[PDB]
């Protein structure tokens, strides 16, 4: 039900996931920290579709929602530590974890 707003919504973040990792390709801490903004602004209109669609176990849905915000949390962490060791991982993970919610989200079982 409403389908096009959760399939549009994850495609905005792919195309803006990737235009977030260009952006770290030049080093420019400030727009990335600008898109970051923008993502989790993107995540919670997403988060509140999928919270309400919810069709698999509470308990994972809540705990997956933990892991993003983990996610992102230890992103501008590793910003703030200059650490771009951590910044290329935690993109490979996004990208990852992109992967895993879209196909969650056509209900691949």
Known sequence: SEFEKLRQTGDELVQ?????????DK????????VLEEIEELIQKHRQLFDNRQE??????????????????????????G????????????????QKIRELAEKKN
Do not use: M, N
């Open 56 to 81: 698999a176990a509470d308990t994972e849905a809540a705990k997956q929602g933990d892991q993003w915000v983990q996610l992102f949390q230890r992103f501008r962490e590793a910003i703030d530590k």
């Open 27 to 34: 080093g420019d801490d400030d727009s990335l920290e600008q």
């Open 16 to 24: 803006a996931f990737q235009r977030l990792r260009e952006i770290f």
């Open 83 to 98: 650490d771009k060791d951590s910044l290329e991982q935690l993109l490979e993970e996004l990208e990852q974890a992109l």
